[PDB]
Assembly symmetry: C4
Homo-oligomer: 33 residues x 4
């Protein structure tokens, strides 16, 4: 269960690192001159 | 507790997959031609 | 440890539900007519 | 494993607190008068 939980957390972290790679689309829609 | 924790993680993942489905509203407010 | 972990997850969920209440500021900056 | 899991959660929380410090860039791109 423990090393299942840990390898859900390393799914959550690799979602967050998708969400950051959306936020850095959004910041670059909102742009360089 | 373990398979409670795991089924909080599968609540966290199904929040993140709401947050992604806000980010993909925001990116499509910021739009197609 | 288990019911510590679970009550970090219920900290993570109550962050996500701050992050959603930023996203629903951002969507309402981006607005009603 | 438990106090490994807990110290992934305190990695997740310190990601979320990066994501909040992007959202508060985005809200301040979208600005003060």
């Amino acid at each position: 269960r423990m090393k299942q939980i840990e390898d859900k957390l390393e799914e959550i972290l690799x979602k967050l690192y998708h969400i950051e790679n959306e936020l850095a689309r959004i910041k670059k829609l909102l742009x360089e001159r």
